[PDB]
Amino acid sequence: LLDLIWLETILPKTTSFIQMKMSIMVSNQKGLIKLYFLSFLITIMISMTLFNYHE
Amino acid sequence: AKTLLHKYSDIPEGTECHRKAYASTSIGGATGLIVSAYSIALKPPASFLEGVARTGRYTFTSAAIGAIFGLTSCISAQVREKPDDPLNYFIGGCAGGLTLGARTRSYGIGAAACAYMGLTAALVKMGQLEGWQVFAEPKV
Amino acid sequence: PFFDVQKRLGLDLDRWMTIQSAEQPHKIPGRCHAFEKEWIECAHGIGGIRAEK
Amino acid sequence: MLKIIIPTTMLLPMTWMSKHNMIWINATVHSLLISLISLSLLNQLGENSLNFSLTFFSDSLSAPLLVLTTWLLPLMLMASQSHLSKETTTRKKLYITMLILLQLFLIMTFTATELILFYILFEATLVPTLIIITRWGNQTERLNAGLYFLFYTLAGSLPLLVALVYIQNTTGSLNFLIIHYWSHPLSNSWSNIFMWLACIMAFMVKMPLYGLHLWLPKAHVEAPIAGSMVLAAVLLKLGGYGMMRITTILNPLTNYMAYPFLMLSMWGMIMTSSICLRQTDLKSLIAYSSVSHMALVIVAIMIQTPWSFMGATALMIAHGLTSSMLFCLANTNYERVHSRTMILARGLQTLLPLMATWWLVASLTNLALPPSINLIGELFIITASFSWSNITIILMGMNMMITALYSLYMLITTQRGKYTHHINNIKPSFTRENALMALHILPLLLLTLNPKMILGPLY
Amino acid sequence: PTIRLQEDPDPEDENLYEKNPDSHGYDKDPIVDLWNMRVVFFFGFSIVLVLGSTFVAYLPDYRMQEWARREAERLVKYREANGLPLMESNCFDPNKIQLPEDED
Amino acid sequence: NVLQIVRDHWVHILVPVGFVFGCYLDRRSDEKLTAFRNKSLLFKRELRPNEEVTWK
Amino acid sequence: WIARTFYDGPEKNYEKTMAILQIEAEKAELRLKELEVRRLMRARGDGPWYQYPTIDKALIDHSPKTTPDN
Amino acid sequence: MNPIIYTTLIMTVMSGTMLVMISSHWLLIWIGFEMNLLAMIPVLMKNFNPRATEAATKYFLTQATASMMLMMAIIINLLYSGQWTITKMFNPVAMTMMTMALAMKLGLSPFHFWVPEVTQGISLQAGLLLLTWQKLAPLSVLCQISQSINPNLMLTMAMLSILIGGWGGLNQTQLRKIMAYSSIAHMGWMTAVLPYNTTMTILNLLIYITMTLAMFMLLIHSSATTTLSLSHTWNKMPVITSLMMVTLLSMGGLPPLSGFMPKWMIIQEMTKNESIIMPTLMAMTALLNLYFYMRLAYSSSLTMFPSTNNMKMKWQFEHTKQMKLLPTMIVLSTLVLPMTPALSSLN
Amino acid sequence: MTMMSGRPGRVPLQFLPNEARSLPPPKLTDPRLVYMGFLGYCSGLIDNAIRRRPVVSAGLHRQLLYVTSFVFFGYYLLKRQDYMYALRDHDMFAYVKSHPEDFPEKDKKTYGEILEEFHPVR
Ligand SMILES: CCCCCCCCCCCCCCCCCC(=O)OC[C@H](COP(=O)([O-])OCC(O)COP(=O)([O-])OC[C@@H](COC(=O)CCCCCCCCCCCCCCCCC)OC(=O)CCCCCCCCCCCCCCCCC)OC(=O)CCCCCCCCCCCCCCCCC
Ligand SMILES: CCCCCCCCCCCCCCCCCC(=O)OC[C@H](COP(=O)([O-])OCC(O)COP(=O)([O-])OC[C@@H](COC(=O)CCCCCCCCCCCCCCCCC)OC(=O)CCCCCCCCCCCCCCCCC)OC(=O)CCCCCCCCCCCCCCCCC
């Protein structure tokens, strides 16, 4: 119950699961310039409104 | 912007719980809107109405998390008469985590979110108390 | 980063066009020649941090 | 102390310039000579350490560890040449190179005067160990074990690095002598609490602490015999040495920051001793034994008394020798029958009597029979814990029973009963294995004769 | 082929006693084996073990145990002869310690 | 005939030579830490009529 | 015989420790002083360090400019 | 492509970079960027195929957009202060636009999407050039305008770069994409210390360039672009795989290898200011890069994968073209930590 | 941030100012120089290994040139590093001397009059 299941569940298995999920989320892009150029536009507006407005 | 952060922060910890909850709700809504914008840009929803649905879902989830966190943090701080105590922020973070778990309808997400958000909120309160800087200004 | 090749060789590759008050053709002056001249002589040789104040 | 460091760096090209069939002889002879040379560090003072230079120093706590490392290298060499006979010459030289580099890193780690240099060497020890485990291990789990061995360490050590440099930007020095003399109390703030955690967690995960120990069974089971020897006998003592060193700057926070770790250490010592009672793998039993003994050492270091430090030092030395002997004894049977299950080869006392005597002596020493140094360390730690709190004598006492049980259990499972009928490939014990057992066991009783050599600086 | 890959079979283990009834377990070559045994036994038992134990047993007293015993004997004799207490609760002379002026 | 003997067993002097080199380097390190030689309050001493330094 | 053949007296180790301690203490004090000096120099900009470039005054043309008022 | 034409194009790329590096006029820096892009576009399409054309088109679009933002920032700075010299960037909006344009040119997150695609679409030599030489000019400009940077935006982009590099590289079986994600993470590391010390930025860039050059030369020597084709090299030349494994360990930042020196130093620098949380998070995140380097080392050097029969023929031939700078690059990539203080020569 | 690029009197691309000639040159037996030579020897060995030549005995002229080049560059590298650190200490001491109010020397207090709290370990 403790050594083979829960101590494994909390520290290493959770870390591996989270890293795998985030890797799948990040690397799964279709390679279409339309989508991430739209994202570039969003990023530029966010940068001018969040950081630039506060000087 | 920092206007929402200041509007949340200028209120004392254990005073005016409704205003603190409102400010937290505003911050959560802004975060959800930004997340929805990026998600729609990178993962097109194939339909305008489905895009509005996804934006509303994300925004409501984030706003609910923020409102619950703010309300419970303020209520605990004022009930215990113990401001500047990280335990109130821990309780608020776990309440927000349980809200997220209920929103996604998953016990594992709820428990993990409660634990991690409680630790993160306690750490944020500790940093506010001790003066920890996330983006340090260059000094040397 | 910045390799001051011009300073080492004394070449003046692009410094003739950096400022408004620098030896224009036919000695035509800029609208703010005196102001920029005064600012430049004020801030010379003391560093950017000091010159900002 | 370059008179010890340079001969190892000379062991390197001597191994790489040796004739194809003379590598083992040269390596063993010169490693034994280096151990004889390192024997001179036991002549310590009563007040301060041996400050050889601005970089290296020797203390009454690090000299026994250095002697144990230099003595363990030849034993690994003898224990490795059996299962590496079919290997090519270049890969054999690479294996010996890994062993020599590990010894060099450990020697420099145990004598560094600087905490960042100590961190660099104590982290450099990972690469040869990881390469050995993941390249010369036998089963397919080894790869996973390597990962478990790596990140578990690094996640504990990377915060420490940050803390270390932070300290150097506050006090101006990380030299151990200046740190000791210019020591100042730690206040009670959240920043100090997290600095304490950053300074402690690396050595607590290298012990390993109960709950953070999951890497150890994998690493000590899938490793080759030399890898298991060095992992159990020396590499676990890095955490103890580092905690004994770093605790000088953590007072008086430890006074109340030790409670969760003390609770974990005691209850997990009981838990791992109980786990040893139901183990189908013979190597895993020894690994969990190591976990229990290191939990005792953690308690001794955490309660911060002179008797506790003396007992902890004695226990580290005794555990290193005993666990290395137990791993070699298990590896003999594994090489005979190619299986790690404890109930596979039974009744081996009938077939191998002298091996049964070696097993009996190793098991008697494991359960801390008087007047062995195992008992001396355990009893000193128990007396210190009793002074700390009278109720501890319950838990400690519990452990004392359970250990004995599982210890004799192993013996009764492997040596007594009746031999398995279908196993007919059990050849007589070679002179090499008997010599390995004797060279493990004789120093133990010889140190029992003169126990003040392993009692540390608090003596 | 109903197979997955071309591979050698797993070979049987070699018994060192077959070609060398007195094999010492060190090497397949009898001469290198015998000399490995000889060097191990000579440099492990004869040189390091016995001579190292003799060297450790006769290490000079750098811990100053005998010196401390003699110093304690001197001090005990003096303090008992002149009637002073055998030990003092203060290890430092109060004359060189300056307490803070005000305790209120 | 010693040619083959040497070319086979010349690897046996690397470790002893390293030992002597390490001793020499330890002495060289010792010679750079003499700023307080015969200057400590506990061991400050008058020189003998012949000797030049209290320790090397 | 062992002490005469293999070891020295305690004064050698004593004074070597003295020298090592002096060197390390001086290094620590120098490190702290350098950190303070860096902080002050970056804050004020009145030292040799953190000197950022400014327009050279030698580029200005001090000539009549076809207009009396520049 | 003609060898003379290829040499001219390569020299024009380097000339654009040098023009960026030696100029004091914003117009000349912009011209250097334009010339570098113009000469770089054909180099990516040296081997003509649809993937190379797609990579060139994506690179051209990204860099042209970045250069237009660059010129607009220059013009705004001129409007609010009639200065052309590269200096403290007297206007904040212009500085935000400059930071965004230079981040887009470098591939910093969230303008990182083009880097893996362009690296995967071109040959190994072109990828080497793109991932090593093309980082000098924007980083030089950033170093020159470092005193006026907004630390919040720069540090946010650096942290995002490290996180995204680790997470994206976790999912790759193609070696070029792995290199691109490693590059993104290392650019994050380089730009995290830029507001505090540019000498640390230069040191990190030099060590990264050395390690990347060694890695790419080892990948060209053993003609592998996927993990499985690299798993065959042990049966043809094991020394190359062993050197590759040690180089991967150095890239993972393990002591006592030289790849440990940059991060270490950066951490120390970031601890001289207060900045405690960010380096801890940064090391925690670099553990991901170390993880997938370790996975590559498992696949190529520490275990033996099955081979093919035709490999026997390859046993009978030697490598014809020989890279003269590979051994020095490997040695500098690995055994350089003891010479750490020599970094004082950088400032 | 850049500490020493804008330091007055700095020649752009010198790599070794004349003031550096006022410092003692590194000894030719310097351990850092020996390590640089070791790096050159390792580079030669790796070159031999990659080309599939006898690693230790293949090319002696190439190995000797490797060692010579590494030592030759390391000598000047060490000279420049020592010059840079001497410059740093020079500027530090000058700044401390020119700002006495920012670096006061307060009265020394002995341990007999400093009240240090005692924390029992029990
Ligand atoms: C190094 C040393 C060793 C350390 C390591 C080892 C030890 C630690 C690790 C092991 C334990 C940690 C596990 C954490 C929870 C795991 C949940 C999970 O896996 O989700 C995935 C998994 C996937 O679910 P799913 O696929 O999404 O949905 C299908 C369901 O399975 C289908 O579900 P269902 O239809 O069968 O029924 C679901 C329903 C109904 O459940 C049932 O049907 C059966 C009834 C179970 C309810 C349990 C509570 C009632 C009785 C408790 C009485 C007192 C507790 C003991 C305290 C002693 C005080 C003297 O349950 C609920 O609705 C949950 C709502 C909340 C009620 C329970 C939460 C109580 C929190 C404890 C408060 C303690 C405060 C401090 C006390 C200090 C004094 C000591 O979820 C589950 O299936 C498990 C459901 C039950 C979870 C609640 C159990 C609580 C256990 C104690 C928590 C405290 C420890 C953690 C501390 C950190 C928190 C800040
Ligand atoms: C085969 C092994 C298989 C494997 C097993 C594992 C083995 C592993 C081994 C590893 C290596 C081990 C190395 C360890 C090194 C340790 C050496 C050492 O430190 O020496 C210390 C110690 C020497 O002390 P010391 O500090 O050097 O001397 C200081 C004084 O200045 C001296 O005082 P002194 O001025 O009076 O001179 C005394 C002198 C001369 O004194 C005398 O001659 C007088 C004696 C009295 C006789 C007087 C009457 C007899 C004659 C009368 C009739 C003839 C005279 C008249 C003629 C007419 C006939 C009527 O005699 C001696 O010096 C003592 C003998 C030296 C022995 C040294 C041991 C070296 C061991 C290293 C090799 C290890 C391998 C073993 C090989 C050894 C050989 C087999 O050696 C001893 O062992 C002494 C023990 C004898 C005391 C009596 C026992 C008392 C028992 C009471 C307890 C009862 C409870 C039950 C327990 C029973 C247990 C016995």
Ligand SMILES: CCCCCCCCCCCCCCCCCC(=O)OC[C@H](COP(=O)([O-])OCC(O)COP(=O)([O-])OC[C@@H](COC(=O)CCCCCCCCCCCCCCCCC)OC(=O)CCCCCCCCCCCCCCCCC)OC(=O)CCCCCCCCCCCCCCCCC
């Ligand atoms: C810290 C303190 C100081 C230590 C510094 C660091 C360590 C030493 C420096 C490292 C670099 C130096 C050597 C690099 C080039 C060697 C490349 C090579 O392939 O070697 C093979 C070569 C044998 O080839 P061969 O003789 O032509 O004929 C056999 C066939 O080639 C048959 O060959 P094959 O190709 O068919 O065999 C295939 C084999 C071929 O693969 C290999 O050979 C592996 C070599 C890896 C190269 C290392 C990468 C770069 C260096 C970074 C090291 C990191 C160290 C930091 C700690 C982390 C540990 C990794 O691949 C495998 O079997 C795969 C097995 C996987 C094992 C995984 C471990 C690999 C990496 C471990 C590196 C450990 C350090 C280097 C160990 C020594 C290597 C010779 O080895 C040698 O003979 C050279 C070694 C001895 C030369 C020096 C002799 C000195 C002269 C004697 C007098 C002494 C003077 C004293 C002065 C006082 C007056 C008396």
Ligand SMILES: CCCCCCCCCCCCCCCCC[C@@H](O)O[C@H](CO[C@H](O)CCCCCCCCCCCCCCC)COP(=O)(O)OCC[N+](C)(C)C
């Ligand atoms: C799997 C095994 C891994 C190893 C486990 C390591 C154990 C680490 C545990 C850390 C020990 C103590 C941490 C902090 C010290 C006190 C803890 C706290 O409960 O005490 C009170 C703290 O009060 C409240 O508890 C506030 C803290 C509540 C928020 C903390 C989150 C706890 C949730 C537990 C999650 C599990 C953590 C481990 C994750 C793996 C004391 O009151 P207070 O005087 O005010 O604080 C003292 C500090 N002052 C003086 C500066 C003010």
Ligand SMILES: CCCCCCCCCCCCCCCCC[C@@H](O)O[C@H](CO[C@H](O)CCCCCCCCCCCCCCC)COP(=O)(O)OCC[N+](C)(C)C
């Ligand atoms: C095969 C069958 C065997 C059975 C038959 C055997 C026959 C008899 C042999 C057994 C001997 C019985 C032992 C009886 C005790 C006598 C020896 C004892 O007296 O010697 C001690 C001396 O013991 C030694 O000090 C201990 C030996 C040191 C152990 C080092 C081991 C060698 C190093 C190898 C590597 C170490 C690895 C572990 C890392 C620490 C005395 O200690 P001490 O009170 O002082 O002496 C005072 C007088 N002095 C100082 C002038 C000498």
Ligand SMILES: CCCCCCCCCCCCCCCCC[C@@H](O)O[C@H](CO[C@H](O)CCCCCCCCCCCCCCC)COP(=O)(O)OCC[N+](C)(C)C
């Ligand atoms: C992984 C190892 C990295 C090694 C990096 C490459 C090493 C080989 C390259 C050889 C360099 C040749 C240059 C020598 C010709 C003279 C050129 C000289 O004039 O350049 C000076 C500059 O000198 C160079 O900086 C010194 C180069 C030395 C770099 C090596 C240090 C690497 C860190 C320590 C690791 C150990 C390295 C081992 C070396 C083999 C000009 O200074 P300055 O114009 O005013 O600065 C411009 C930039 N500023 C203003 C923004 C600061």
Ligand SMILES: CCCCCCCC/C=C\CCCCCCCC(=O)O[C@H](COC(=O)CCCCCCC/C=C/CCCCCCCC)COP(=O)(O)OCCN
């Ligand atoms: C394999 C699992 C092992 C787990 C290892 C991780 C445990 C280590 C605990 C985290 C250490 C992070 C702190 C880094 C070093 C601290 C050094 C320090 O003293 O800095 C403090 C500041 O301390 C901090 O900033 C720390 C904040 C925490 C940020 C990172 C959180 C990491 C996770 C925390 C929870 C986990 C801790 C317990 C884990 C137990 C083991 C699982 C002082 O800064 P100042 O600004 O100068 O303060 C006075 C002036 N204002």
